Design an enzyme around this catalytic site. Structure first.
Site, PDB file in Angstrom:
ATOM      1  N   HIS A 150       0.946  -1.121   0.000  1.00 51.82           N
ATOM      2  CA  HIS A 150       0.000   0.000   0.000  1.00 51.82           C
ATOM      3  C   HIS A 150       1.001   1.187   0.000  1.00 51.82           C
ATOM      4  O   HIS A 150       2.083   1.008   0.566  1.00 51.82           O
ATOM      5  CB  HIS A 150      -0.798   0.313   1.271  1.00 51.82           C
ATOM      6  CG  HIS A 150      -1.673  -0.853   1.609  1.00 51.82           C
ATOM      7  ND1 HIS A 150      -1.228  -1.970   2.263  1.00 51.82           N
ATOM      8  CD2 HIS A 150      -2.995  -1.052   1.349  1.00 51.82           C
ATOM      9  CE1 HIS A 150      -2.248  -2.789   2.416  1.00 51.82           C
ATOM     10  NE2 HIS A 150      -3.331  -2.259   1.876  1.00 51.82           N
ATOM     11  N   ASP A 202       2.597   1.909   3.298  1.00 51.80           N
ATOM     12  CA  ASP A 202       3.400   0.851   3.903  1.00 51.80           C
ATOM     13  C   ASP A 202       4.848   1.280   3.634  1.00 51.80           C
ATOM     14  O   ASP A 202       5.687   1.182   4.508  1.00 51.80           O
ATOM     15  CB  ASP A 202       3.157  -0.538   3.336  1.00 51.80           C
ATOM     16  CG  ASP A 202       1.766  -1.140   3.500  1.00 51.80           C
ATOM     17  OD1 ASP A 202       1.179  -0.823   4.563  1.00 51.80           O
ATOM     18  OD2 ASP A 202       1.257  -1.873   2.624  1.00 51.80           O
ATOM     19  N   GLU A 204     -11.417  -6.159  -4.226  1.00 52.34           N
ATOM     20  CA  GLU A 204     -11.340  -7.197  -3.182  1.00 52.34           C
ATOM     21  C   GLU A 204     -12.566  -7.112  -2.282  1.00 52.34           C
ATOM     22  O   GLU A 204     -12.714  -6.085  -1.594  1.00 52.34           O
ATOM     23  CB  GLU A 204     -10.098  -6.979  -2.353  1.00 52.34           C
ATOM     24  CG  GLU A 204      -9.905  -8.037  -1.256  1.00 52.34           C
ATOM     25  CD  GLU A 204      -8.492  -8.096  -0.739  1.00 52.34           C
ATOM     26  OE1 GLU A 204      -7.587  -7.440  -1.258  1.00 52.34           O
ATOM     27  OE2 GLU A 204      -8.418  -8.880   0.234  1.00 52.34           O
ATOM     28  N   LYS A 224     -15.113  -8.196   0.886  1.00 54.26           N
ATOM     29  CA  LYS A 224     -14.981  -8.629   2.294  1.00 54.26           C
ATOM     30  C   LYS A 224     -16.355  -8.369   2.924  1.00 54.26           C
ATOM     31  O   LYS A 224     -16.931  -7.296   2.634  1.00 54.26           O
ATOM     32  CB  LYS A 224     -13.891  -7.891   3.049  1.00 54.26           C
ATOM     33  CG  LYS A 224     -13.551  -8.512   4.404  1.00 54.26           C
ATOM     34  CD  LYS A 224     -12.341  -7.832   5.026  1.00 54.26           C
ATOM     35  CE  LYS A 224     -11.962  -8.469   6.361  1.00 54.26           C
ATOM     36  NZ  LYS A 224     -10.861  -7.620   6.862  1.00 54.26           N
ATOM     37  N   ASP A 238      -5.800 -13.669  -2.979  1.00 57.04           N
ATOM     38  CA  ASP A 238      -5.129 -13.500  -1.681  1.00 57.04           C
ATOM     39  C   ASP A 238      -5.394 -14.818  -0.913  1.00 57.04           C
ATOM     40  O   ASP A 238      -6.561 -15.203  -0.755  1.00 57.04           O
ATOM     41  CB  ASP A 238      -5.717 -12.334  -0.914  1.00 57.04           C
ATOM     42  CG  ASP A 238      -5.029 -11.021  -1.202  1.00 57.04           C
ATOM     43  OD1 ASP A 238      -3.986 -10.950  -1.863  1.00 57.04           O
ATOM     44  OD2 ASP A 238      -5.544  -9.975  -0.744  1.00 57.04           O
ATOM     45  N   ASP A 242      -6.340 -14.075   9.468  1.00 52.29           N
ATOM     46  CA  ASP A 242      -5.104 -13.938   8.675  1.00 52.29           C
ATOM     47  C   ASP A 242      -4.032 -14.977   9.003  1.00 52.29           C
ATOM     48  O   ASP A 242      -2.869 -14.558   9.149  1.00 52.29           O
ATOM     49  CB  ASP A 242      -4.603 -12.502   8.859  1.00 52.29           C
ATOM     50  CG  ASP A 242      -5.422 -11.524   8.064  1.00 52.29           C
ATOM     51  OD1 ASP A 242      -5.941 -11.795   6.993  1.00 52.29           O
ATOM     52  OD2 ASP A 242      -5.608 -10.350   8.463  1.00 52.29           O
TER      53      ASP A 242
HETATM   54  O1  LIG Z   1      -8.337  -7.723   5.236  1.00 55.01           O
HETATM   55  C1  LIG Z   1      -7.532  -6.633   4.788  1.00 55.01           C
HETATM   56  C2  LIG Z   1      -7.357  -6.861   3.252  1.00 55.01           C
HETATM   57  O2  LIG Z   1      -7.258  -8.280   3.076  1.00 55.01           O
HETATM   58  C3  LIG Z   1      -6.120  -6.103   2.766  1.00 55.01           C
HETATM   59  O3  LIG Z   1      -4.951  -6.676   3.319  1.00 55.01           O
HETATM   60  C4  LIG Z   1      -6.102  -5.952   1.241  1.00 55.01           C
HETATM   61  O4  LIG Z   1      -5.923  -7.154   0.491  1.00 55.01           O
HETATM   62  C5  LIG Z   1      -5.283  -4.761   0.682  1.00 55.01           C
HETATM   63  O5  LIG Z   1      -5.791  -3.503   1.157  1.00 55.01           O
HETATM   64  C6  LIG Z   1      -5.390  -4.781  -0.887  1.00 55.01           C
HETATM   65  O6  LIG Z   1      -4.185  -5.498  -1.270  1.00 55.01           O
HETATM   66 CO   LIG Z   2      -6.409  -9.210   1.199  1.00 55.95          CO
HETATM   67 CO   LIG Z   3      -7.909  -9.756   4.419  1.00 52.49          CO
END
Ligand SMILES: OC[C@@H](O)[C@@H](O)[C@H](O)[C@@H](O)CO
Ligand SMILES: [Co+2]
Ligand SMILES: [Co+2]
Ligand SMILES: OC[C@@H](O)[C@@H](O)[C@H](O)[C@@H](O)CO
Ligand SMILES: OC[C@@H](O)[C@@H](O)[C@H](O)[C@@H](O)CO
Ligand SMILES: OC[C@@H](O)[C@@H](O)[C@H](O)[C@@H](O)CO
Ligand SMILES: [Co+2]
Ligand SMILES: [Co+2]
Ligand SMILES: [Co+2]
Ligand SMILES: [Co+2]
Ligand SMILES: [Co+2]
Ligand SMILES: [Co+2]
Lengths: 392, 392, 392, 392
Positions: free
Chosen positions: B52, B55, B179, B181, B243, B255
């Protein structure tokens, strides 16, 4: 309140007719006569009735028998003024469907499934149904290696394209609604959520003829937000039908009266459906109750439970209306910026070039100050519940 | 076994770099240096790294520092031979994103989120990234009345359309992966499952540019079958990235190392990804580990856990191939009619007219005799498991 | 509605004081001074406050600071009239406790955890607290081979026994309440439910000094019925304290305002606690709110949510009272035979031999006939919801 | 690996005999004759059989009939060398039990329930059974106001105290095992988890005679750790029996073959039961398989699935043994300090006074330094999994 035909409340013949034989015990009630069911429902305010082929006509009835049944059925409909808005086919009871209908591994079962459905389409078209609902309860698996999903979706698509063709050719004018469910009776069911079913439908030959029939409890079996999923279905314009009931999260299929499971979600669902854009409802098809009278009840409990679904819907509708007309709620909505989401993020004619050029969008943006302002969401939630409790 | 660059194992910088500050306690590990990380991961066998923006470059780093950081990072990449297959943007940490980035009720936040992404796009483009991953972690709500879902989808769409536009124009050649969730950190997140995310992408202006990035744990959080959802995604041709991690059903986001949660489903998933058609894998993208070394661990446990993700994938692959090559499995597959699902239900040239004309598909069909034959699925599942246990 | 000191609503300092630093983002609120917290809460109607040692005195404060803090705190309580009914110890935040306090595999950590607690016991006694609450948030594991459960239970017991010994000897007269939680932060926490906590306590050396402090959201995290679990704790007489909040089934720990989760269960709970035998409450301790003001709110939202809890509880009580007072409810209750369960199955002085001789209990019993009568449960439930909805 | 009588594998008559009639479809298999079942089970390696009264003698069989069946049954046992270690009673199928057996709101059903059970006790005693299992499947409710939990526990207790009195007067020497289940068939069942059942049992008149019969799937339906619950039952010494099967988290009751659901927890469970205290098993009772052959299977499938149960246990046993015998595991165990938990926190003769005097336990304790050391739990878990996979 009292329901009007305007309310469009319908029930499946199999709801009030469930004999209450569960996975662990015998039936606690005797069978309900379909004609009697028509009369009773009409009487409680239903505007229509729905049924699976096998609910009306006992699997394997000769043509004389079947013809006789249909005839009396139509007479009851005529007399009460109830309509048949949707019809469906049972592709899950008979042992032959143990590995599915359209997606059974066995080719012969797949051919038979399609013929059972075509036959039901004819009967639907004749009763005036406008939609054919498809609940693939046996399409899925208990073990990952027993089912090729890709092959399964191809086969699913293959059967559905044929059905649209037949309908279009006969000029039946039906629409098709796929009903998602995560599990039960298979360990895992194909097209498990409303999302999965919408994405699938988008791959058919004539997508415009296909939508979904999401059910409250089915989405709650995965602990998903039912109202939020419905909102998305409406954004796609794929909510062709809806099955209303109650459930207590992830556990077996309870099929409670609508409002008897997650009350708060039931409340926001009625707000979404009725308090649509421009005063009017956002949804205009049948409000179908796909529930079951608890096993502890007798026929008095059955009619009570049928009336409870309508009462629950009307009470919530009333409270949703009041909620929105409350100047304090409006003020809270304004403070929470709910409506500001409806204004495009980009100005009229603004592209990336201009946004990139706008220093107030990045270079001079005080993230820290904006990040400190509260949205007042809790206070808004509290007003909503007070309306639901009749405290406001 | 040993990992090769052809295995395409990648890790996010935030994975081994997670300091283990959880919702209830302080960080148990010090900060990981990004260059060290690059060195460490190249050593264990990763072929690429992802991150990110925040990061790598501390939020609010001046141009000088930012550049400084990037340049050192590029050396590390150079030195090591690691690539950056995808990049992502953090739209969830800073307080300004508490109600979302792209679908924040606050219009100024939406504008800011776009700007923040555009900038990462540039960095990504410059690093050779082929995909932009978008995780809308704060897009959602804790209370139903606080978010107009329809409006939010419009704004989500509006933001994505613009990113595609910019990418195409700058000639970045990026693909975009959403992604999904179900929850955490918001009570309910928009686009909760792989299904909901595929349905959405299909409504964008250049849909061919968008796919999804499903995560093992995200789907399991709703108790859905991960392998089956990935099978559907591949059916749709929307598996842009994946992922991998572990989870123990519906509870907080764990995780864990891949295969440390649902072992049976990790096995079936490796089988699906690698035992693709024409002998070859059904998926050719990066196998990204989006996991976290448990809080009870130190840096030794950190590298131990990174290596465990690779060992788990490779041990499962090895058993999946042995499974498929076993003649007894081949015999079970045949008895279960797994491949018969691949043969079309209709004979070439048959339509509803010819199907209706076949008395053998309905009128003369013996459902009872067909329904008495077993599919041999339990035996097939037992063979799969014995292969996983190395017992055959 | 207005709260009185007799309602005994308490809040933990850590509730309204939660800065909203979740697992995915930074704090959105500044720190709350304990003294201000005391004035604020007295102000919204609370009768007492609770705290973790570390909530009041920063971990590692010298005795001068520590003492100073305690004196100011004491003044505030003084001026406001608020009491401290229970105190607790933070055995989860500091890295040292990453594997637990009392059950850490590390012996030195176990000795330290006990000392930390003994000290908090001293403060509690000086402040007049009557109950010590113990939430073993870090006791448990992420991996099965990592924790010897049996050894863990011996060590939990060893520590508790010493605490009881000390209190008894210094004459503090404290009672101990163990707080069950199924998961979060550990993959799995020891004593996961109200049942497991009750069974464990039964094994201590002075069991009469021990009970549980069950929390709404904790039991709902496992999709368990909170009301039914409290009913059982009451039957055993182990309900020493109770933490009220809201949650939406199995997902991360939400800690919403009481009643903002499962509203129907919040209703039945208030009913159970307040409409005890003889008009009087079945429970007499503090009704503590262990919730968190949503991350999207500011201090205004914080005070709002503190009041929402009290409000929710009083609106529900009002409706539970009305429910029970309704003659139609009273009639439905009679029809459903709810009170008939209070009549012993056996006649006075009747044993197995008289029972075996009663032909009406078996030989001449018409199970089919009894099996067909309904219980009228749907109707009774419909009545309860209409009361909740303020429609009756 | 082949089964020995020493392995003590047992099956309920109702497992292999399940006709696969589910909540949504007709039975796919014909009835299994009991004598046949005994013969087939003896052949696959089972050492004993269990049954509900109604599984053996059809509900309502006259005495001549009932008597003939038993005689035939006993002859099969005789010939095969199979024993009846436990017996149970069906207090869930017949409509009379729709609101429960022992806790039905209706007093006459309660009386009838006890008589049906005393009758089964006599037969169990005649067959040599040592345990009476009681699964209160119909005890609970769909609605909170329908069931007075407190009264229900009083009546549950009243009934059990009587059963014990009878057994003890007659010299039967039975032990009683309550079987917990969170839901299904009732919305919520009384005594939902192993802990709730153990706490209850401690309240009976002759508690030494009562324990529990936990089932893998029943705990998993709540997403609880089965091995960890069994560890706590062993610690209380209340593990009188165990039902083994598979399940995939919270959804309907699956009753898969043991190890076909959560394989990782199936592994740790076998390690707990077999790698007991001395070298000897920690549990000495029957390993009962309470599962159901999938609906998709015929009798070939039925017999395959029976064998699969035994095969899964013996394969896991083998791997659990290998795991514990590995020097690298011993080393990982040592680094994780698993065994250090077994050492008392206090030194012999140390009390609070000596602990308080130890500056090193607090005043001079370096918590920061201790909190920085890792436990190496991931590495230990990775070694376990590799043993499971036969990778070492
Ligand atoms: O649960 C948090 C999510 O899994 C995160 O780690 C994402 O994958 C990231 O923001 C995109 O790569
Ligand atoms: Co993820
Ligand atoms: Co995640
Ligand atoms: O859970 C069963 C499902 O809800 C079913 O009732 C379908 O709705 C029907 O077969 C299609 O109408
Ligand atoms: O989930 C957090 C937990 O509920 C906590 O707030 C405790 O109740 C406290 O540590 C003991 O009072
Ligand atoms: O969920 C079914 C349950 O597990 C049952 O089969 C019991 O074990 C039996 O009634 C007592 O042995
Ligand atoms: Co349904
Ligand atoms: Co339905
Ligand atoms: Co809590
Ligand atoms: Co709490
Ligand atoms: Co069971
Ligand atoms: Co069982």
């Amino acid at each position: 309140v009292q329901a009007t035909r305007e309310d469009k409340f319908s029930f499946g013949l199999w709801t009030v007719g469930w004999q209450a034989r569960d996975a662990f015990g015998d039936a606690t009630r005797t069978a309900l006569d379909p004609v009697e069911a028509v009369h009773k429902l009409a009487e409680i305010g239903a505007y229509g009735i729905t049924f699976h082929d096998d609910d009306l006509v006992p699997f394997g009835s000769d043509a004389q028998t079947r013809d006789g049944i249909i005839a009396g059925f139509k007479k009851a409909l005529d007399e009460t003024g109830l309509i048949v808005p949707m019809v469906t086919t049972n592709l899950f009871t008979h042992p032959v469907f143990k590995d599915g209908g359209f997606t059974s591994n066995d080719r012969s079962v797949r051919r038979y499934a399609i013929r059972k459905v075509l036959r039901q389409m004819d009967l639907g078209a004749e009763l005036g149904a406008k939609t054919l609902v498809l609940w693939g309860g046996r399409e899925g698996a208990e073990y990952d290696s027993a089912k090729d999903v890709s092959a399964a979706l191809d086969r699913y698509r293959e059967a559905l394209n044929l059905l649209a063709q037949y309908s279009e050719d006969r000029g039946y004018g039906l629409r098709f609604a796929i009903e998602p469910k995560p599990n039960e009776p298979r360990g895992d069911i194909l097209l498990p959520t409303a999302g999965h079913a919408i994405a699938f439908v988008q791959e058919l030959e004539r997508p415009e003829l296909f939508g979904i029939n999401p059910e409250t409890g089915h989405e709650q079996m995965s602990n998903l937000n039912f109202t939020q999923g419905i909102a998305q279905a409406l954004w796609h314009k794929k909510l062709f039908h809806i099955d209303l009931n109650g459930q207590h999260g992830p556990k077996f299929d309870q099929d409670l009266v609508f409002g008897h499971g997650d009350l708060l979600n039931a409340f926001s669902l009625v707000d979404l459906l009725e308090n649509g854009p421009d005063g009017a409802p956002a949804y205009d098809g049948p409000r179908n109750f796909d529930y079951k009278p608890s096993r502890t009840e007798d026929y008095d409990g059955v009619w009570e439970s049928a009336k409870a679904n309508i009462r629950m819907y009307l009470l919530l509708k009333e409270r949703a209306k009041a909620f929105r007309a409350d100047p304090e709620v409006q003020e809270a909505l304004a403070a929470s910026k709910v409506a500001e989401l409806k204004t495009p993020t980009l100005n009229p004619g603004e592209g990336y070039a201009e946004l990139l050029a706008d220093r107030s969008a990045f270079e001079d943006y005080d993230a820290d100050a904006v990040g400190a302002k509260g949205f007042g969401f809790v206070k808004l939630n509290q007003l909503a519940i007070e309306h639901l409790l009749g405290a406001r």
